[PDB]
Amino acid sequence: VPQTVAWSAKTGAVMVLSNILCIVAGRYVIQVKGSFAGFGLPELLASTSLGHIVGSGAILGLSYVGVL
Amino acid sequence: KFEVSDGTPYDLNVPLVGAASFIGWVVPTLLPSQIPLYGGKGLSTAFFASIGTNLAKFPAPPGMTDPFWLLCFIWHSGLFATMILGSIGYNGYAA
Amino acid sequence: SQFIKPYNDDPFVGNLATPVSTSSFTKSLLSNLPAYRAGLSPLLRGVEIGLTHGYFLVGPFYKLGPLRNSDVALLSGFFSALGLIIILVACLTIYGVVSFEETEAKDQLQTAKGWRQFTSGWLVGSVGGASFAYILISNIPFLQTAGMSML
Amino acid sequence: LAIPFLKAPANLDSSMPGYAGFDPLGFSDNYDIKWLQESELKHGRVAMLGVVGLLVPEFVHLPMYDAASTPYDAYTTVPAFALTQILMGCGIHEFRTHKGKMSPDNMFDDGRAPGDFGWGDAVMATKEIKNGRLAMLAFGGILHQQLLTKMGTIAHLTGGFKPLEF
Amino acid sequence: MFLISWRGYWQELIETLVWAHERTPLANLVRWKDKPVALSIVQARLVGLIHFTAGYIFTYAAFVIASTTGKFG
Amino acid sequence: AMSDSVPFLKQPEALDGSMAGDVGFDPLGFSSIGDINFLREAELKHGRIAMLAAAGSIAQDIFTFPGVSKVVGTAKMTGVHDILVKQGAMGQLLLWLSFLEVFGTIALLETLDGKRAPGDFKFDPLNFSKNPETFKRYQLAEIKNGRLAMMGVGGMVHGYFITGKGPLELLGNF
Amino acid sequence: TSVIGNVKMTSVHDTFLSMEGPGKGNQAAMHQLLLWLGILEIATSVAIIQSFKGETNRAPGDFGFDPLGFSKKAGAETMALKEIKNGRLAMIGIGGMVHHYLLTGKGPLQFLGGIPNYKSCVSHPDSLLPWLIKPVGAVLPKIC
Ligand code: CLA
Ligand code: CLA
Ligand code: CLA
Ligand code: CLA
Ligand code: CLA
Numbered sequence A: 001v002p003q004t005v006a007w008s009a010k011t012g013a014v015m016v017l018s019n020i021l022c023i024v025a026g027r028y029v030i031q032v033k034g035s036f037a038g039f040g041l042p043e044l045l046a047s048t049s050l051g052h053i054v055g056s057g058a059i060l061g062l063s064y065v066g067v068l
Numbered sequence B: 001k002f003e004v005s006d007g008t009p010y011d012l013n014v015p016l017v018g019a020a021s022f023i024g025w026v027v028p029t030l031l032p033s034q035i036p037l038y039g040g041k042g043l044s045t046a047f048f049a050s051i052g053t054n055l056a057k058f059p060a061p062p063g064m065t066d067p068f069w070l071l072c073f074i075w076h077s078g079l080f081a082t083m084i085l086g087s088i089g090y091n092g093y094a095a
Numbered sequence C: 001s002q003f004i005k006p007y008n009d010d011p012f013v014g015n016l017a018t019p020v021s022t023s024s025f026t027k028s029l030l031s032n033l034p035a036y037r038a039g040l041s042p043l044l045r046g047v048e049i050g051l052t053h054g055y056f057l058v059g060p061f062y063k064l065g066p067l068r069n070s071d072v073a074l075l076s077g078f079f080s081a082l083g084l085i086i087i088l089v090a091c092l093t094i095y096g097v098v099s100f101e102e103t104e105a106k107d108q109l110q111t112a113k114g115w116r117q118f119t120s121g122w123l124v125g126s127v128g129g130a131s132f133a134y135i136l137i138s139n140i141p142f143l144q145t146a147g148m149s150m151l
Numbered sequence D: 001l002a003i004p005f006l007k008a009p010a011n012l013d014s015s016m017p018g019y020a021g022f023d024p025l026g027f028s029d030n031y032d033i034k035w036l037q038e039s040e041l042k043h044g045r046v047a048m049l050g051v052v053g054l055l056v057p058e059f060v061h062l063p064m065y066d067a068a069s070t071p072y073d074a075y076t077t078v079p080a081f082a083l084t085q086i087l088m089g090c091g092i093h094e095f096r097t098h099k100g101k102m103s104p105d106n107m108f109d110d111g112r113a114p115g116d117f118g119w120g121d122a123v124m125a126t127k128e129i130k131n132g133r134l135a136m137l138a139f140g141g142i143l144h145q146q147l148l149t150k151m152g153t154i155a156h157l158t159g160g161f162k163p164l165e166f
Numbered sequence E: 001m002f003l004i005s006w007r008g009y010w011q012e013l014i015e016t017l018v019w020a021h022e023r024t025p026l027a028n029l030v031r032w033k034d035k036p037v038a039l040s041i042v043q044a045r046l047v048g049l050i051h052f053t054a055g056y057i058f059t060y061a062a063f064v065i066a067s068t069t070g071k072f073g
Numbered sequence F: 001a002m003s004d005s006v007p008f009l010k011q012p013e014a015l016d017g018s019m020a021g022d023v024g025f026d027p028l029g030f031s032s033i034g035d036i037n038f039l040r041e042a043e044l045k046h047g048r049i050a051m052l053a054a055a056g057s058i059a060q061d062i063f064t065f066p067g068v069s070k071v072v073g074t075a076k077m078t079g080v081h082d083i084l085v086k087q088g089a090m091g092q093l094l095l096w097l098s099f100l101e102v103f104g105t106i107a108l109l110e111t112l113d114g115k116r117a118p119g120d121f122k123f124d125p126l127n128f129s130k131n132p133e134t135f136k137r138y139q140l141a142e143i144k145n146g147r148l149a150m151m152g153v154g155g156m157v158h159g160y161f162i163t164g165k166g167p168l169e170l171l172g173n174f
Numbered sequence G: 001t002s003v004i005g006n007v008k009m010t011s012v013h014d015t016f017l018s019m020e021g022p023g024k025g026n027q028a029a030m031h032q033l034l035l036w037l038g039i040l041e042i043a044t045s046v047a048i049i050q051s052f053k054g055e056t057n058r059a060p061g062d063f064g065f066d067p068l069g070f071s072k073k074a075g076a077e078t079m080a081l082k083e084i085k086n087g088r089l090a091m092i093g094i095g096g097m098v099h100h101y102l103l104t105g106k107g108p109l110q111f112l113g114g115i116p117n118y119k120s121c122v123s124h125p126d127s128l129l130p131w132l133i134k135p136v137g138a139v140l141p142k143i144c
């Protein structure tokens, strides 16, 4: 079984970083919606949902490879 | 002046597409893995080592359970995918 | 950038100009084949085509025939190839008899005299190519075992 | 002029600070030049700060934290909420030094130059660009050596200087 | 096959084959003297009847001779 | 009409005689299939690599750098490669030559457009070729020594495969 | 003779080839000859193809090989006749000498000096086409 870790501040840091990266990426690449003008609740929900998806994948992968 | 059709001159860009696709497929596949198929090496390096091992045993072909066939199939599959995508990107966009 | 165009710039003919059909590689290969290469008499077209086809005809008969496990496997395979060559020459002859009218023109394949010249060249080339394959397999042990002599 | 056997970059001029005619790939021909110069200056300044931040923690330490043996290792031993706070503070500083126009085609529309934030010769700009360009590669070297040897930079240089392997 | 499938399907297949032979290099040098067509309706009924009848006769003849030979001879 | 190197063959169409070392030698007609500039850039790269390999085979027979004999022992030529794949020297060489050859690939893109002479990397720091006549003489000498070096490296490595000695030791212990 | 022994005319080809090949032996004499002659013959093939189609007005058999300038000498207008005549004569002569070695095993000079060659036949190995000498015993007299 691949090693997963208990919740810590590192897990929170990775999740927060992935969420913020996905929020900025969603600001830049979403075609149909000063830089945060037009920023609405569905776009925030989509970006934070991708942020949990990317953060979960990154946390599981870094726990797999030993970076924790 | 290679015509790809009756009256359609087209640049195949075989040197660039071949070189760029080879480098862009080989370099990511230098990532090592500890599985016995790779033997501690990357996919490209395990493939090259298997080539050397089986060329050291000429006439005698690699056996069915030998990792050469799986390494060759995966490496050439990824290489062909890279060559197709590189031909698409460079011949179409050109920028 | 379109790769498929109407054939011969004619949109109503029953053909399309495709990379497989009309590229530079395809045009060079087709124009350099002996059936289409310029400057050849029909007899020499027959000679080249017959040499190639009669040369490769020996192999399947030698390796897979009913006498393949006997010491006379190559002799039987060559004889079977020669019989197939004679049958195909008869086919060529009757095709030319029923297909062409007797005309003065003799420099083209699709004339009566031209087809007779092509048939003569194909017979001589097929016999020569089959005999060459027989000689090479008879004298080289690599060809007898299809490479297994190296093991 | 940097690479004489390749053609000169058409989107490059000697007026640009640190110009050497060095763009063999042609990033300037495909991306906005002002965006590239702004990114180069920010990567530069951040790498200069990182070069200093990988050297000085080897000798002095803040008592509020635990002294990591390697100055690169400090992100693994301090609380990670420190790093999250540094991220958020850097983000508000990006929002404040800019006017909220943190995107291409929003930047430079005030006639803003690439890299100026109102903190101050054009020989000085070249000095900036070169001392940031050097600091980027130097930072890469210092980080990867401190990661591979698990020891400080000056400790590596003065004592042992063993070859790095992984 | 000749009693269930009927003509127009086979005629359209033969049309595609005629196109293929006319457009194939090194084979369009060879030309038919008679145009290839599908078998006619009555002809196909007759040919299916002939194959059917021959199968009937040969199957039962083989069965009756071999069964009587195996049991008694 | 006829070639100079092979007098009984018609002169190749893609060979005008402008490139250095052009004696009309293309009996198989490879310049009619491939681009002449691509083939010339390949010829110069193979020849320059062969010049370095020939000089290196001779010098590695003559002397080794300090500390090399600790790692390689008595291994010579080809036998070094495997050993120094493990030590890491060949990896560093592969890395930096690949880095240079990325810009070499861009240079190949320049020469396939017709905007760059094949093999021209503008690398003359010492200004040996300041006279176009001396430049022509140096181009002829470069291509002749490159082809001779290709032959030489073939001979040296296959003589080492046969005897295991190396070039100069085979010249001495024959 | 330390490599191949006392074989004279066609058993040299056979003996060398018996000792030629990776694994089979150490010689490469006939293979080296085949390699360099095949390079020359491919370069000749291109010339034959060019002269056949008419792209070149070169004479048949002319390779431009006259380093000593005998064409610019006197009496060179009959050299082609002497070449073709001695060529045909050598064709017949080597056919003679090979079919003499296949029966007596001597070689040319011993065969010329040993005029009753069926009274003293040198023992020689069978050629690489031994089936062709099979009718000599049964069908033919087999004087030797
Ligand atoms: C910090 C970044 C990070 C890191 C280090 C990793 C690391 C890893 N991830 Mg992970 N991941 C990340 C971010 C990261 N991930 C993110 C952001 C996401 C998005 C949520 C994911 C989503 C993800 C999934 C969903 C899975 C991983 C898995 C893995 C492990 C892969 C094991 C392996 O060899 O692959 C396997 C290598 C293969 C070659 C297998 C082939 C896989 C399928 C069967 C083939 C499908 C391809 C198909 C044929 C189509 C191709 C045809 C084409 C021509 C069209 C590895 C430890 C896997 C895992 O945890 O396994 C235990 C896994 O299932 N990752
Ligand atoms: C396998 C490697 C690979 C991949 C994934 C891409 C992908 C891409 N290239 Mg690209 N490229 C490659 C190799 C590759 N390239 C090489 C080798 C060259 C040099 C010859 C180029 C030169 C090139 C140019 C010059 C340009 C691109 C562009 C693009 C983008 C849009 C055009 C396109 O092909 O979309 C392909 C779309 C997808 C891949 C996404 C769909 C996903 C599905 C599942 C298909 C993917 C198949 C499969 C999963 C791939 C597996 C890869 C394999 C190695 C494992 C896209 C992101 C253009 C662009 O706008 O980008 C800047 C552009 O201008 N490329
Ligand atoms: C907007 C203003 C603001 C505020 C209110 C804070 C507040 C805080 N920062 Mg912070 N910071 C800011 C701006 C701000 N920051 C900026 C602009 C930057 C630069 C980008 C930073 C960079 C930064 C770093 C790098 C670090 C902090 C840390 C901290 C925490 C210190 C207390 C602690 O460790 O207990 C933890 C506090 C909580 C769990 C929640 C607060 C609950 C109460 C108030 C705690 C009381 C603690 C008390 C003061 C001291 C207890 C020990 C005492 C006996 C000595 C605290 C929550 C440190 C930290 O996160 O440590 C964990 C740390 O290392 N900050
Ligand atoms: C090599 C160091 C160096 C140099 C020469 C400059 C030079 C310049 N910077 Mg700059 N900068 C640097 C480092 C440097 N910076 C670093 C590390 C950061 C990140 C904190 C910044 C962040 C920054 C911003 C945000 C801005 C500038 C700007 C400017 C320009 C102001 C014009 C002016 O008033 O002229 C007079 C210039 C000077 C007198 C230069 C002062 C630099 C002194 C010499 C450095 C002192 C060295 C000293 C040892 C420091 C101790 C550090 C030690 C602990 C390691 C000028 C070209 C502004 C500009 O117009 O953008 C281009 C601007 O908006 N810089
Ligand atoms: C094809 C070229 C080639 C290759 C692959 C090798 C490979 C090798 N050499 Mg060798 N060598 C070469 C050429 C080559 N050599 C040349 C040309 C010489 C000098 C005549 C030497 C002299 C030499 C010695 C003395 C030793 C090696 C050794 C080695 C081994 C370890 C690497 C090392 O320390 O190299 C060191 C080699 C050098 C420092 C020579 C560098 C010369 C450069 C390449 C000349 C070109 C510079 C040029 C002006 C700039 C180009 C600009 C660019 C834009 C084109 C390795 C197997 C060592 C070993 O293991 O011995 C068995 C060792 O002790 N080499």
Ligand SMILES: CC1=C(C#C/C(C)=C/C=C/C(C)=C/C=C/C=C(C)/C=C/C=C(\C)C#CC2=C(C)C[C@@H](O)CC2(C)C)C(C)(C)C[C@H](O)C1
Pocket: F050, F051, F052, F054, F055, F123, F124, F125, F126, F127, F128, F145, F146, F148, F149, F151, F152, F153, F154, F155, F156, F159, F166, F167, F168, F170, F171
């Ligand atoms: C361009 C640039 C310059 C640069 C430069 C570069 C560095 C130029 C350096 C060049 C050298 C490397 C040329 C090497 C040629 C080697 C061949 C010809 C000899 C081959 C041996 C054969 C005959 C053999 C072998 C034989 C057989 C096979 C096996 C053996 O048993 C025996 C034997 C040995 C006899 C400089 C720096 C000056 C500056 C300038 O401003 C511009």
Ligand SMILES: CC1=C(C#C/C(C)=C/C=C/C(C)=C/C=C/C=C(C)/C=C/C=C(\C)C#CC2=C(C)C[C@@H](O)CC2(C)C)C(C)(C)C[C@H](O)C1
Pocket: G065, G066, G067, G068, G069, G070, G086, G087, G089, G090, G092, G093, G094, G096, G097, G100, G108, G109, G111, G112
């Ligand atoms: C091109 C030209 C030149 C060239 C040249 C050189 C290479 C010319 C080389 C020439 C060869 C050697 C001429 C050989 C002729 C052989 C025939 C006539 C005799 C045949 C045997 C007879 C029939 C017999 C037999 C007999 C019977 C059968 C059986 C036996 O028992 C007895 C016996 C043996 C008597 C050079 C290089 C100078 C340069 C110049 O610028 C260009």
Ligand SMILES: CC1=C(C#C/C(C)=C/C=C/C(C)=C/C=C/C=C(C)/C=C/C=C(C)/C=C/C2=C(C)CCCC2(C)C)C(C)(C)C[C@H](O)C1
Pocket: G010, G013, G014, G091, G092, G094, G095, G096, G098, G099, G127, G128, G129
């Ligand atoms: C090396 C090697 C081998 C070999 C071999 C070789 C080299 C064998 C033999 C080769 C050749 C070329 C034989 C030629 C025979 C020529 C004849 C009979 C000519 C008759 C001419 C006449 C009658 C002319 C008549 C005439 C004509 C036309 C014109 C008028 C005058 C007149 C005289 C009437 C093997 C096979 C042993 C195998 C071994 O493993 C390897």
Ligand SMILES: CC1=CCCC(C)(C)[C@H]1/C=C/C(C)=C/C=C/C(C)=C/C=C/C=C(C)/C=C/C=C(C)/C=C/C1=C(C)CCCC1(C)C
Pocket: C051, C052, C053, C055, C056, C124, C125, C127, C128, C129, C131, C132
């Ligand atoms: C492999 C290759 C790679 C993949 C793609 C690919 C292209 C499809 C594929 C090719 C497969 C195919 C296409 C390979 C190509 C194949 C063909 C079958 C080769 C035929 C050669 C015929 C020669 C040798 C006979 C020559 C005549 C000799 C000299 C005769 C002398 C005779 C004359 C009459 C005079 C009398 C003496 C005798 C002896 C009787």
